[PDB]
Tab-separated table of N, CA and C in Angstrom:
chain	number	residue	atom	x	y	z
A	12	UNK	N	62.095	-57.226	72.894
A	12	UNK	CA	61.145	-56.116	72.764
A	12	UNK	C	60.687	-55.608	74.127
A	13	UNK	N	60.551	-54.304	74.214
A	13	UNK	CA	60.123	-53.679	75.448
A	13	UNK	C	59.186	-52.489	75.191
A	14	UNK	N	58.182	-52.311	76.063
A	14	UNK	CA	57.223	-51.236	75.916
A	14	UNK	C	57.437	-50.177	77.004
A	15	UNK	N	56.640	-49.093	76.909
A	15	UNK	CA	56.725	-48.057	77.903
A	15	UNK	C	55.475	-47.192	77.949
A	16	UNK	N	54.798	-47.194	79.093
A	16	UNK	CA	53.560	-46.408	79.232
A	16	UNK	C	53.859	-45.124	80.023
A	17	UNK	N	53.543	-44.009	79.366
A	17	UNK	CA	53.773	-42.709	79.986
A	17	UNK	C	52.542	-41.795	79.872
A	18	UNK	N	52.412	-40.824	80.745
A	18	UNK	CA	51.288	-39.932	80.717
A	18	UNK	C	50.901	-39.505	79.294
A	19	UNK	N	51.499	-38.434	78.829
A	19	UNK	CA	51.203	-37.927	77.500
A	19	UNK	C	52.138	-38.566	76.464
A	20	UNK	N	51.568	-38.937	75.332
A	20	UNK	CA	52.356	-39.556	74.271
A	20	UNK	C	52.853	-38.522	73.256
A	21	UNK	N	54.043	-38.744	72.713
A	21	UNK	CA	54.659	-37.834	71.714
A	21	UNK	C	53.911	-37.859	70.387
A	22	UNK	N	54.152	-36.822	69.594
A	22	UNK	CA	53.518	-36.712	68.279
A	22	UNK	C	54.103	-37.681	67.290
A	23	UNK	N	53.264	-38.288	66.436
A	23	UNK	CA	53.691	-39.232	65.439
A	23	UNK	C	54.020	-38.549	64.119
A	24	UNK	N	53.088	-37.740	63.622
A	24	UNK	CA	53.253	-37.033	62.368
A	24	UNK	C	52.375	-35.790	62.328
A	25	UNK	N	52.924	-34.696	61.728
A	25	UNK	CA	52.191	-33.466	61.630
A	25	UNK	C	52.600	-32.685	60.371
A	26	UNK	N	51.619	-32.326	59.567
A	26	UNK	CA	51.883	-31.587	58.346
A	26	UNK	C	50.631	-31.039	57.710
A	27	UNK	N	50.810	-30.107	56.760
A	27	UNK	CA	49.685	-29.505	56.074
A	27	UNK	C	49.042	-30.466	55.073
A	28	UNK	N	47.730	-30.704	55.214
A	28	UNK	CA	47.026	-31.604	54.320
A	28	UNK	C	45.682	-31.029	53.937
A	29	UNK	N	45.295	-31.292	52.697
A	29	UNK	CA	44.019	-30.771	52.175
A	29	UNK	C	42.916	-31.825	52.312
A	30	UNK	N	41.797	-31.405	52.908
A	30	UNK	CA	40.681	-32.324	53.116
A	30	UNK	C	39.487	-31.893	52.240
A	31	UNK	N	39.081	-32.795	51.351
A	31	UNK	CA	37.955	-32.517	50.446
A	31	UNK	C	36.836	-31.776	51.183
A	32	UNK	N	36.174	-30.888	50.473
A	32	UNK	CA	35.078	-30.133	51.050
A	32	UNK	C	33.925	-30.985	51.461
A	33	UNK	N	33.852	-31.342	52.742
A	33	UNK	CA	32.809	-32.205	53.257
A	33	UNK	C	31.421	-31.700	52.817
A	34	UNK	N	31.244	-30.389	52.898
A	34	UNK	CA	29.965	-29.804	52.494
A	34	UNK	C	30.187	-28.555	51.639
A	35	UNK	N	31.103	-28.676	50.676
A	35	UNK	CA	31.403	-27.568	49.796
A	35	UNK	C	31.172	-27.898	48.350
A	36	UNK	N	31.949	-27.283	47.463
A	36	UNK	CA	31.846	-27.503	46.026
A	36	UNK	C	33.032	-28.285	45.500
A	37	UNK	N	33.066	-29.580	45.798
A	37	UNK	CA	34.155	-30.441	45.354
A	37	UNK	C	35.469	-29.705	45.375
A	38	UNK	N	35.648	-28.824	46.361
A	38	UNK	CA	36.879	-28.074	46.510
A	38	UNK	C	37.795	-28.698	47.537
A	39	UNK	N	39.006	-28.183	47.641
A	39	UNK	CA	39.985	-28.682	48.592
A	39	UNK	C	40.545	-27.570	49.470
A	40	UNK	N	40.394	-27.696	50.776
A	40	UNK	CA	40.891	-26.705	51.712
A	40	UNK	C	42.045	-27.253	52.540
A	41	UNK	N	43.038	-26.383	52.808
A	41	UNK	CA	44.196	-26.785	53.589
A	41	UNK	C	43.872	-26.777	55.076
A	42	UNK	N	44.494	-27.674	55.826
A	42	UNK	CA	44.294	-27.749	57.274
A	42	UNK	C	45.450	-28.459	57.959
A	43	UNK	N	45.768	-28.031	59.181
A	43	UNK	CA	46.857	-28.632	59.943
A	43	UNK	C	46.439	-29.949	60.548
A	44	UNK	N	47.152	-31.023	60.217
A	44	UNK	CA	46.869	-32.347	60.738
A	44	UNK	C	47.992	-32.857	61.614
A	45	UNK	N	47.636	-33.500	62.736
A	45	UNK	CA	48.618	-34.039	63.652
A	45	UNK	C	48.292	-35.455	64.054
A	46	UNK	N	48.892	-36.417	63.339
A	46	UNK	CA	48.640	-37.824	63.628
A	46	UNK	C	49.009	-38.159	65.066
A	47	UNK	N	48.104	-38.841	65.749
A	47	UNK	CA	48.338	-39.250	67.134
A	47	UNK	C	48.169	-40.734	67.324
A	48	UNK	N	48.244	-41.191	68.563
A	48	UNK	CA	48.117	-42.612	68.894
A	48	UNK	C	46.731	-43.121	68.448
A	49	UNK	N	46.738	-44.057	67.486
A	49	UNK	CA	45.535	-44.631	66.990
A	49	UNK	C	44.435	-43.561	66.821
A	50	UNK	N	44.869	-42.389	66.319
A	50	UNK	CA	43.932	-41.276	66.095
A	50	UNK	C	44.593	-40.193	65.266
A	51	UNK	N	43.790	-39.300	64.724
A	51	UNK	CA	44.262	-38.213	63.910
A	51	UNK	C	43.515	-36.923	64.208
A	52	UNK	N	44.228	-35.901	64.677
A	52	UNK	CA	43.606	-34.619	64.990
A	52	UNK	C	44.005	-33.553	63.963
A	53	UNK	N	43.315	-32.444	63.991
A	53	UNK	CA	43.614	-31.335	63.073
A	53	UNK	C	43.169	-30.014	63.646
A	54	UNK	N	43.866	-28.934	63.260
A	54	UNK	CA	43.551	-27.599	63.752
A	54	UNK	C	43.503	-26.596	62.595
A	55	UNK	N	42.981	-25.423	62.867
A	55	UNK	CA	42.881	-24.360	61.866
A	55	UNK	C	44.226	-24.079	61.251
A	56	UNK	N	45.274	-24.095	62.085
A	56	UNK	CA	46.630	-23.831	61.604
A	56	UNK	C	47.647	-24.604	62.443
A	57	UNK	N	48.924	-24.450	62.126
A	57	UNK	CA	49.988	-25.102	62.834
A	57	UNK	C	50.123	-24.580	64.270
A	58	UNK	N	49.489	-23.443	64.503
A	58	UNK	CA	49.519	-22.811	65.822
A	58	UNK	C	49.032	-23.790	66.909
A	59	UNK	N	48.178	-24.729	66.503
A	59	UNK	CA	47.644	-25.714	67.415
A	59	UNK	C	46.901	-25.042	68.569
A	60	UNK	N	46.083	-24.054	68.225
A	60	UNK	CA	45.307	-23.309	69.234
A	60	UNK	C	44.298	-24.233	69.909
A	61	UNK	N	43.282	-24.645	69.138
A	61	UNK	CA	42.247	-25.518	69.690
A	61	UNK	C	41.816	-26.550	68.653
A	62	UNK	N	41.672	-27.807	69.077
A	62	UNK	CA	41.243	-28.870	68.192
A	62	UNK	C	39.867	-28.600	67.617
A	63	UNK	N	39.758	-28.554	66.310
A	63	UNK	CA	38.503	-28.305	65.639
A	63	UNK	C	37.710	-29.591	65.449
A	64	UNK	N	38.390	-30.606	64.879
A	64	UNK	CA	37.745	-31.893	64.665
A	64	UNK	C	38.712	-33.069	64.781
A	65	UNK	N	38.197	-34.233	65.118
A	65	UNK	CA	39.019	-35.418	65.245
A	65	UNK	C	38.567	-36.517	64.309
A	66	UNK	N	39.497	-37.412	63.951
A	66	UNK	CA	39.186	-38.513	63.034
A	66	UNK	C	39.723	-39.842	63.593
A	67	UNK	N	38.796	-40.784	63.844
A	67	UNK	CA	39.127	-42.105	64.372
A	67	UNK	C	39.867	-42.983	63.361
A	68	UNK	N	40.961	-43.570	63.778
A	68	UNK	CA	41.746	-44.411	62.907
A	68	UNK	C	41.773	-45.857	63.415
A	69	UNK	N	40.602	-46.433	63.623
A	69	UNK	CA	40.469	-47.784	64.121
A	69	UNK	C	39.906	-48.704	63.040
A	70	UNK	N	40.753	-49.670	62.616
A	70	UNK	CA	40.333	-50.614	61.583
A	70	UNK	C	40.013	-49.890	60.263
A	71	UNK	N	40.627	-48.715	60.106
A	71	UNK	CA	40.406	-47.929	58.894
A	71	UNK	C	41.223	-48.436	57.725
A	72	UNK	N	40.905	-48.016	56.523
A	72	UNK	CA	41.620	-48.445	55.327
A	72	UNK	C	42.268	-47.259	54.624
A	73	UNK	N	43.506	-46.963	54.966
A	73	UNK	CA	44.243	-45.870	54.364
A	73	UNK	C	45.129	-46.352	53.218
A	74	UNK	N	44.992	-45.709	52.062
A	74	UNK	CA	45.798	-46.051	50.914
A	74	UNK	C	45.569	-45.070	49.762
A	75	UNK	N	46.451	-45.107	48.770
A	75	UNK	CA	46.349	-44.225	47.620
A	75	UNK	C	44.943	-44.236	47.058
A	76	UNK	N	44.423	-43.036	46.687
A	76	UNK	CA	43.074	-42.929	46.143
A	76	UNK	C	42.931	-43.772	44.887
A	77	UNK	N	41.715	-43.855	44.368
A	77	UNK	CA	41.428	-44.636	43.172
A	77	UNK	C	40.915	-43.725	42.042
A	78	UNK	N	41.057	-44.209	40.804
A	78	UNK	CA	40.635	-43.477	39.613
A	78	UNK	C	39.118	-43.333	39.523
A	79	UNK	N	38.413	-44.081	40.365
A	79	UNK	CA	36.942	-44.033	40.373
A	79	UNK	C	36.427	-43.109	41.475
A	80	UNK	N	37.365	-42.438	42.165
A	80	UNK	CA	37.001	-41.529	43.240
A	80	UNK	C	37.024	-40.090	42.729
A	81	UNK	N	37.037	-39.906	41.416
A	81	UNK	CA	37.057	-38.587	40.842
A	81	UNK	C	38.101	-37.706	41.509
A	82	UNK	N	39.280	-38.269	41.750
A	82	UNK	CA	40.346	-37.529	42.415
A	82	UNK	C	41.393	-37.069	41.396
A	83	UNK	N	41.341	-35.782	41.019
A	83	UNK	CA	42.280	-35.205	40.053
A	83	UNK	C	43.409	-34.465	40.762
A	84	UNK	N	44.144	-35.207	41.621
A	84	UNK	CA	45.250	-34.605	42.357
A	84	UNK	C	46.360	-35.660	42.607
A	85	UNK	N	47.586	-35.274	42.321
A	85	UNK	CA	48.727	-36.187	42.522
A	85	UNK	C	49.088	-36.289	44.003
A	86	UNK	N	49.588	-37.442	44.419
A	86	UNK	CA	49.961	-37.641	45.805
A	86	UNK	C	48.739	-37.511	46.730
A	87	UNK	N	47.706	-38.268	46.445
A	87	UNK	CA	46.496	-38.206	47.250
A	87	UNK	C	46.111	-39.570	47.762
A	88	UNK	N	45.524	-39.632	48.951
A	88	UNK	CA	45.098	-40.899	49.556
A	88	UNK	C	43.707	-40.772	50.201
A	89	UNK	N	43.051	-41.897	50.385
A	89	UNK	CA	41.716	-41.920	50.998
A	89	UNK	C	41.716	-42.854	52.205
A	90	UNK	N	40.902	-42.501	53.209
A	90	UNK	CA	40.784	-43.279	54.423
A	90	UNK	C	39.311	-43.492	54.782
A	91	UNK	N	38.834	-44.744	54.654
A	91	UNK	CA	37.472	-45.051	54.970
A	91	UNK	C	37.395	-46.369	55.748
A	92	UNK	N	36.350	-46.490	56.600
A	92	UNK	CA	36.171	-47.696	57.398
A	92	UNK	C	35.310	-48.702	56.638
A	93	UNK	N	35.033	-48.421	55.371
A	93	UNK	CA	34.227	-49.314	54.546
A	93	UNK	C	32.762	-49.300	54.979
A	94	UNK	N	32.258	-48.106	55.290
A	94	UNK	CA	30.881	-47.961	55.731
A	94	UNK	C	30.661	-46.699	56.543
A	95	UNK	N	31.513	-46.446	57.498
A	95	UNK	CA	31.405	-45.262	58.346
A	95	UNK	C	31.470	-43.994	57.532
A	96	UNK	N	32.678	-43.655	57.077
A	96	UNK	CA	32.883	-42.448	56.276
A	96	UNK	C	34.123	-42.590	55.393
A	97	UNK	N	34.150	-41.836	54.306
A	97	UNK	CA	35.294	-41.856	53.391
A	97	UNK	C	36.040	-40.533	53.382
A	98	UNK	N	37.148	-40.471	54.074
A	98	UNK	CA	37.956	-39.263	54.143
A	98	UNK	C	38.961	-39.202	52.982
A	99	UNK	N	39.393	-38.001	52.634
A	99	UNK	CA	40.349	-37.811	51.553
A	99	UNK	C	41.411	-36.766	51.959
A	100	UNK	N	42.645	-37.033	51.564
A	100	UNK	CA	43.760	-36.122	51.878
A	100	UNK	C	44.729	-36.055	50.694
A	101	UNK	N	45.141	-34.808	50.394
A	101	UNK	CA	46.069	-34.600	49.282
A	101	UNK	C	47.387	-33.992	49.802
A	102	UNK	N	48.488	-34.719	49.622
A	102	UNK	CA	49.779	-34.250	50.043
A	102	UNK	C	50.437	-33.360	48.986
A	103	UNK	N	50.942	-32.208	49.440
A	103	UNK	CA	51.598	-31.274	48.536
A	103	UNK	C	52.796	-31.918	47.830
A	104	UNK	N	53.388	-32.909	48.471
A	104	UNK	CA	54.532	-33.600	47.942
A	104	UNK	C	54.310	-35.111	47.911
A	105	UNK	N	54.976	-35.811	46.977
A	105	UNK	CA	54.865	-37.250	46.843
A	105	UNK	C	55.518	-38.009	48.000
A	106	UNK	N	56.646	-37.510	48.469
A	106	UNK	CA	57.362	-38.122	49.568
A	106	UNK	C	56.511	-38.127	50.848
A	107	UNK	N	55.590	-37.172	50.938
A	107	UNK	CA	54.713	-37.067	52.095
A	107	UNK	C	53.557	-38.055	51.984
A	108	UNK	N	52.804	-37.986	50.907
A	108	UNK	CA	51.677	-38.893	50.693
A	108	UNK	C	51.962	-40.275	51.217
A	109	UNK	N	52.994	-40.929	50.666
A	109	UNK	CA	53.372	-42.254	51.108
A	109	UNK	C	53.570	-42.320	52.594
A	110	UNK	N	54.454	-41.456	53.132
A	110	UNK	CA	54.729	-41.393	54.540
A	110	UNK	C	53.448	-41.488	55.361
A	111	UNK	N	52.457	-40.699	54.976
A	111	UNK	CA	51.183	-40.681	55.661
A	111	UNK	C	50.492	-42.014	55.557
A	112	UNK	N	50.161	-42.413	54.319
A	112	UNK	CA	49.498	-43.693	54.069
A	112	UNK	C	50.032	-44.766	55.008
A	113	UNK	N	51.304	-44.713	55.310
A	113	UNK	CA	51.935	-45.703	56.173
A	113	UNK	C	51.778	-45.287	57.640
A	114	UNK	N	52.002	-44.025	57.915
A	114	UNK	CA	51.903	-43.489	59.271
A	114	UNK	C	50.493	-43.675	59.843
A	115	UNK	N	49.502	-43.041	59.208
A	115	UNK	CA	48.119	-43.141	59.639
A	115	UNK	C	47.559	-44.535	59.286
A	116	UNK	N	48.210	-45.217	58.343
A	116	UNK	CA	47.755	-46.528	57.918
A	116	UNK	C	48.055	-47.590	58.970
A	117	UNK	N	49.297	-47.612	59.429
A	117	UNK	CA	49.734	-48.588	60.427
A	117	UNK	C	48.837	-48.539	61.664
A	118	UNK	N	48.650	-47.334	62.199
A	118	UNK	CA	47.826	-47.119	63.388
A	118	UNK	C	46.449	-47.724	63.188
A	119	UNK	N	46.017	-47.834	61.922
A	119	UNK	CA	44.699	-48.372	61.587
A	119	UNK	C	44.763	-49.877	61.427
A	120	UNK	N	45.882	-50.376	60.923
A	120	UNK	CA	46.090	-51.795	60.677
A	120	UNK	C	46.553	-52.486	61.969
A	121	UNK	N	46.272	-53.786	62.071
A	121	UNK	CA	46.665	-54.568	63.225
A	121	UNK	C	47.340	-55.866	62.827
A	122	UNK	N	48.631	-55.985	63.103
A	122	UNK	CA	49.381	-57.190	62.746
A	122	UNK	C	48.975	-58.355	63.658
A	123	UNK	N	49.346	-59.553	63.240
A	123	UNK	CA	49.018	-60.749	64.015
A	123	UNK	C	47.597	-60.674	64.565
A	124	UNK	N	46.655	-60.318	63.685
A	124	UNK	CA	45.272	-60.203	64.085
A	124	UNK	C	44.332	-61.038	63.230
A	125	UNK	N	43.188	-61.409	63.793
A	125	UNK	CA	42.181	-62.196	63.059
A	125	UNK	C	41.494	-61.404	61.946
A	126	UNK	N	40.586	-62.041	61.239
A	126	UNK	CA	39.881	-61.422	60.132
A	126	UNK	C	40.841	-60.637	59.246
A	127	UNK	N	41.991	-61.220	58.990
A	127	UNK	CA	43.019	-60.611	58.148
A	127	UNK	C	43.895	-61.646	57.459
A	128	UNK	N	44.120	-61.467	56.191
A	128	UNK	CA	44.957	-62.401	55.426
A	128	UNK	C	46.089	-61.732	54.720
């Protein structure tokens, strides 16, 4: 195994994802998301003009949503730190949802680490 530290890091994953209305009417709005190193950014569009908001992916819990989360959408997942905040994302396709849960999930999970079974 070998590592490599370089100035700017390449993109991990980028695609259109819907984020529950943080302060709306239980609605879903589309937004450009670009998974990064142990982090997840998003912009108004794929144009990547200016970063609107960022989401920390440290020790987070990313996985398929639950039936108790009042989520009436196929291929949807939730990401919460178990106290901080509970984010939600709906993938237009099933093949994507999974990909994400693992993409943004791994960056949040830590192998060979304590407090983990």
